[PDB]
Write a protein that binds this ligand. Sequence first.
Ligand SMILES: [Zn+2]
Lengths: 59, 112, 48, 118
Amino acid sequence: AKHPVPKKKTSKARRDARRSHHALTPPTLVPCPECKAMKPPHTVCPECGYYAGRKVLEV
Amino acid sequence: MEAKAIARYVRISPRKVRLVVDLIRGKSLEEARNILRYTNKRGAYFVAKVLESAAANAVNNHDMLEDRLYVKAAYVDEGPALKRVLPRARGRADIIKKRTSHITVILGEKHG
Amino acid sequence: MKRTWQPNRRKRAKTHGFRARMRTPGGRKVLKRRRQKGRWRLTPAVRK
Amino acid sequence: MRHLKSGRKLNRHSSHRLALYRNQAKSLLTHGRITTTVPKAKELRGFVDHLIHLAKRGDLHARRLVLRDLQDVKLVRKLFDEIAPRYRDRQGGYTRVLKLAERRRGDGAPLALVELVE
RNA sequence: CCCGGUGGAUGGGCCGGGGGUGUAAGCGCCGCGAGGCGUUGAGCCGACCGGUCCCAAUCGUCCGAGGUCU
RNA sequence: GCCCCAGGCGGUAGGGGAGCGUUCCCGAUGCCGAUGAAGGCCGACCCGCGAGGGCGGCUGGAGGUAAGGGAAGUGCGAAUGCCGGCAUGAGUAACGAUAAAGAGGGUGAGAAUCCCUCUCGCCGUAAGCCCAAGGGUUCCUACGCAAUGGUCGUCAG
RNA sequence: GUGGAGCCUGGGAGUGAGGGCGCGAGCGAUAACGUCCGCGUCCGAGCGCGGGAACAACCGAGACCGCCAGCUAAGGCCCCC
RNA sequence: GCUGGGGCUAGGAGUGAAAAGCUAACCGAGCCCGGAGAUAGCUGGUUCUCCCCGAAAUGACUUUAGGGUCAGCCUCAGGCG
RNA sequence: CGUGAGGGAAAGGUGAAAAGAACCCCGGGAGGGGAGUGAAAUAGAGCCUGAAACCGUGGGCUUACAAGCAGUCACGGCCCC
RNA sequence: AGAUGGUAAGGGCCCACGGUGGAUGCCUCGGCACCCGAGCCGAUGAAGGACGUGGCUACCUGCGAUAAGCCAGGGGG
Ligand SMILES: [Zn+2]
């Protein structure tokens, strides 16, 4: 290992090019059937605290 | 009308929070609220506070219809980096740039 | 490992102290420059 | 290659995984519901189901078996008294795992509660 | 990539088989005792092979056709 | 005789000639300037062969300075140049011992990180206790969390 | 023979590592993109231009500038061209 | 033998069971300041425009051979023609 | 910073006047939006002007069979005046 | 049979607008140089300092336990 080093400065277009795939997918939400509030699917609605049409957590 | 709030001097990496803010550009206000509330990102919090704050400004100050509110345009200017030192191996020292960020949110009443 | 600065108040006084300088010609010269140069600390300070 | 190999390493060595299972189980029996990272939960389902199954069996040998892990007299008493009855007619599925909508702020980890079934 | 998504056996349980270890504990008896014998191929049992909806894949959301012209 | 005639016009080192621009002196107790100086940004407009100069638009808000001369710290891309910024590497490596953590409760806007309880692991010729040197208030308490703490941090040397 | 010819007198130089090609020689091995000389040229400084595919010195030819004009040089005239 | 504290030996000097080691993290001669803006025939750099002309890389001599003095070749001013 | 002798920084500018932003709202605060002072507030204290590097945000053209010291000439297309 | 423009994850150029930064312009409680004046202080304890002193005092200035000071004269109003 002889300390590899970046040969040249990365041009701006190339930098942004590598950052192309850096997008953040929006977190997909579904409305809580209890309180009509959006929240991640397959989780407890922290608003109503219900899940599977029944109560789970104490909001 | 366009409302606007700005988190001036937010101690956070600008490039990081830019990824968050670029996720709510052009969204309805409710949409952006929910998206912020469930986005696993530290910048998402600051974007949240600036977002709701912009909502208050659009309502109280500029008196816009909160229903038609959407993120017309938001972005993150970079702020004065706080230069600190990271003691590295063999005596030498680095200088980490603890970057500060300015957040700008801009709201309009989408019509139709 | 053991570095070169092993601080010791007595050593620092009887080595670089005011009276250490004043007892020798060259030391007196050093006091003179350090007066002309306007060093606030004319001698390395030490507690007691 | 983890082909067919069952169980999560959980980034802990062997005895630490085991003590994790024991402490997780202890808090679970002591509280019924607990909040923990998802993988710890799913790696805790079976380890609780087994203990509660011995609870359903209830005999002395099961007492010393479950006691080999829980290592408590009192908590095992509650196990063989409050839980063995209430699961006397349930075959498996002694625990439920629900994923919480809100990740842990400190690290972004996803949370989920494990609860004793009703 | 593949599979499953209540119509589900996809995974965890549990059950049954496999497989491994090798006669659990407790008790009884025999021993001064260490121990031995019977209960007992017992008990435990990770992946293995199937069954069982016990527990979980809830409810869901969003994209995505109006077909270029000679 | 300002124009025509003939010829010439690749160019380093280098020799010579001719101009442009910057600071400052005279012009100047002058002139321009709040109707906006300098300066900044912009122009596809005009002058010149060019160095550059006008002129225009917006910013700027208070100096600028002619013709014609003089005097220079006078013209920068390079000097592993100096100072200062901002980049690249890069959201990468790393986050500083593999002694190990988990759960409940509370606090609090905010909790993996703070306080409490319980459970677990580690040291135990110490990773425990006392003194000395050195350190110099870091000690206690209350408050606070801009920064520092390699994350957070409602905690804190 | 009037030429960016010549001479003289002064000021200022840089240069004093050259190279290739041709020819005449030495050395070399009648080897070297070798070395060393003489004559000459080009480059250097003409890595401006056409050709030689590409290529400093091989062939053509000395780039003041512009033109959406024409004639030729070497070299080409089957396509690239 | 190791170690604490108290002190002494220092720069062509000390010390050194001796390696040319160590002498405040680079010791075949410490560091700081000063001489000092040492010297550097060596390396690098040397900043606006336009125009005219336009080299050399040779000889001689050289403690000289990558540097120099003279001459060669450039330019400029004047004179001659 | 150096044991020390000694080396040795950076760092000026609101406004005429603090008139330095009451108060409301969002926010834990910060910060922000209003309001207000102000000739002016992109003069708001991180304050005259505020360049470039750099960074993003919107718009116009353009780009996923494509060869490149990034230019230059022509032609065309699009957009703007 | 055919031809074809088209999409932009992003990128590029240009324009507009921002942020960062602190060049530039202007200014100057500062400094440089030259000339003039003046030119020693100290055992009556100097230069230079430590530490203290304010009602509340971090620091600089002042001063010295009489401690941002005391006395007399002069200036001043
Ligand atoms: Zn709900």
